[PDB]
Design an enzyme around this catalytic site. Structure first.
Site, PDB file in Angstrom:
ATOM      1  N   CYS A 197      -8.785  -0.387   4.269  1.00 17.84           N
ATOM      2  CA  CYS A 197      -8.693  -0.508   5.745  1.00 17.84           C
ATOM      3  C   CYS A 197      -8.049   0.748   6.348  1.00 17.84           C
ATOM      4  O   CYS A 197      -8.423   1.855   5.959  1.00 17.84           O
ATOM      5  CB  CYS A 197      -7.934  -1.789   6.103  1.00 17.84           C
ATOM      6  N   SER A 198      -7.208   0.538   7.358  1.00 13.96           N
ATOM      7  CA  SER A 198      -6.633   1.661   8.109  1.00 13.96           C
ATOM      8  C   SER A 198      -5.111   1.659   8.296  1.00 13.96           C
ATOM      9  O   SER A 198      -4.609   2.264   9.244  1.00 13.96           O
ATOM     10  CB  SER A 198      -7.316   1.815   9.474  1.00 13.96           C
ATOM     11  N   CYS A 199      -4.380   1.016   7.379  1.00 12.59           N
ATOM     12  CA  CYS A 199      -2.923   0.900   7.483  1.00 12.59           C
ATOM     13  C   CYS A 199      -2.272   2.261   7.741  1.00 12.59           C
ATOM     14  O   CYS A 199      -2.546   3.240   7.043  1.00 12.59           O
ATOM     15  CB  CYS A 199      -2.357   0.285   6.197  1.00 12.59           C
ATOM     16  N   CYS A 255      -5.261   4.365   2.758  1.00 12.37           N
ATOM     17  CA  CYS A 255      -5.597   2.957   2.780  1.00 12.37           C
ATOM     18  C   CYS A 255      -7.094   2.830   2.432  1.00 12.37           C
ATOM     19  O   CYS A 255      -7.942   3.002   3.313  1.00 12.37           O
ATOM     20  CB  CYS A 255      -5.293   2.329   4.142  1.00 12.37           C
TER      21      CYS A 255
HETATM   22  O   LIG Z   1      -5.399  -0.113   3.064  1.00 10.17           O
END
Ligand SMILES: [O]
Lengths: 203, 228
Positions: A110-112, A107
């Site tokens: 972000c941090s998915c 990701c």
């Molecule tokens: O992401």
């Protein structure tokens, strides 16, 4: 990396601790946060939800071709057959490693990460070093950081996932495991093998 | 936004730090920061897309080097101030109090069971972002499409390395909450979602592996047809 501007880790931790406790005290006084709520979330992600759940899914796919077909068709529904699902894995899509294709997930924005099958992400997955490089030099990153040599003729598909789709890698079953029990097979399945940064464990 | 969190393709950030064995939470404050998410979500501080937008407004040097869960604290405060739910002067006074008195107790409070029931329902029931819409998808598997060159200052999921690039639709997933509206306080405004494949050479030039591609998630307004 050396940054001459940066305080010591101990001083940083001391300041964060005070700011967090202060914010905590305000949310407690507002009636929206409690210590028991904090303890429950910690118990869930320390003990109840972790990569042992994804390992059960992988080994069922390895040992049941009909389940594997359902898993690749609709990952959320297939995992629900095992009672596995929920927050941050509402929309799972599993992708199959083969002799011709290798999958790796990131990701970059972000941090998915698929919490119901893997638990919370390890810190390196969330950090800018892995995120910046894997979309640009995946073959070199896998070799240098993870000791995983993917031959140059083999296609690498990097899934850069910013939506609520959650991509999970189904690693290939290691050779030398014919007729092993599901419990024995689970010992070869790691969180890293379900991100795609390593294969399942050899031997 | 075009901030430093958009790291795909950036160089020079350093080697990966991967301590051979690590705990889920590295300190007690991390557990607190983690659990504040359901509390602040239920109280109306922010949804998921707004949460990410708050992190995206951090000081860039602080973002790059501070512990991950500190980013969560920053976004809670950002949205607390935005909604009027957190008074900054009171937060600063309480911060000094806990600097000087680190072992002072937290305020007396009831352990309301409905807040724990909320946690259990969210964790095991989920918070699905899929939505039904009244129109069919514009695109289908195999369509050749180009990614928008738009550069909005507000929240979006438009990594700089894919802007203006051409790729092939791999799958249609259905419609979902749209980050470009939801993260900016404009509502869910759901849009059909696709995975699109971009070759390494399309993205990176001749420094591109001829046998690698990036699969990137594109909401419908992000892409326009090249070749059916
Ligand atoms: O992401």
């Amino acid at each position: 990396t050396e940054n001459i501007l940066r305080k010591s880790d101990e001083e940083i931790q001391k300041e964060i601790t005070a700011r967090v406790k202060a914010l905590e005290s305000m949310l407690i006084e507002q009636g929206i946060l409690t210590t028991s709520m904090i303890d429950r979330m910690a118990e869930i992600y320390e003990n109840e939800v972790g990569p042992h759940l994804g390992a059960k899914v992988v080994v069922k796919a390895w040992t049941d071709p009909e389940f594997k077909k359902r898993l690749l068709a609709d990952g959320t529904e297939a995992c629900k057959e095992l009672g596995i699902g929920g927050l941050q894995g509402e929309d799972m899509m599993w992708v199959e490693n083969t002799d011709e294709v290798h999958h790796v997930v990131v990701c970059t924005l972000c941090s998915c990460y698929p919490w119901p099958v893997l638990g919370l992400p390890p810190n390196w997955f969330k950090e800018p070093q892995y995120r910046s490089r894997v979309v640009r030099e995946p073959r070199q990153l896998l070799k240098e950081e993870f000791g995983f040599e993917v031959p140059p003729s083999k296609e690498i598909k990097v899934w850069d996932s910013s939506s609520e789709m959650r991509f999970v890698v189904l690693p290939q079953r290691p050779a030398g495991t014919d007729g092993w029990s599901e419990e024995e097979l689970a010992t070869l399945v790691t969180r890293e093998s379900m991100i795609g940064v390593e294969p399942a464990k050899a031997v | 936004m075009n901030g430093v969190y958009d790291v795909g393709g950036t160089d020079g950030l350093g080697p990966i730090n991967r301590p051979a064995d690590e705990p889920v939470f590295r300190a007690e404050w991390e557990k607190v920061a983690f659990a504040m998410f359901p509390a602040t979500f239920r109280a109306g501080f922010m949804g998921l897309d707004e949460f990410r937008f708050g992190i995206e407004q951090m000081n860039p040097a602080e973002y790059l080097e501070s512990p991950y869960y500190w980013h969560w604290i920053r976004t809670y405060i950002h949205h607390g101030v935005r909604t009027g739910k957190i008074d900054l002067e009171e937060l600063e006074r309480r911060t000094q109090y806990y600097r000087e008195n680190p072992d002072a107790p937290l305020p007396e409070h009831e352990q309301k069971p409905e807040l724990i029931e909320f946690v259990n329902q969210a964790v095991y029931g989920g918070l699905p972002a899929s939505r039904e819409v009244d129109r069919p998808p514009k695109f289908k598997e195999g369509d050749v499409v180009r990614f928008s060159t738009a550069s909005p200052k507000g929240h979006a999921a438009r990594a700089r390395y894919v802007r203006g690039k051409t790729g092939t639709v791999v799958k249609h997933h259905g419609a979902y909450i749209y980050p470009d509206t939801a993260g900016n306080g404009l509502g869910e405004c759901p849009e059909h979602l696709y995975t699109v494949r971009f070759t390494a050479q399309e993205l990176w030039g001749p420094e591109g592996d001829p046998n690698s591609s990036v699969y990137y998630d594109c909401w419908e307004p992000y892409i326009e047809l090249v070749d059916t």
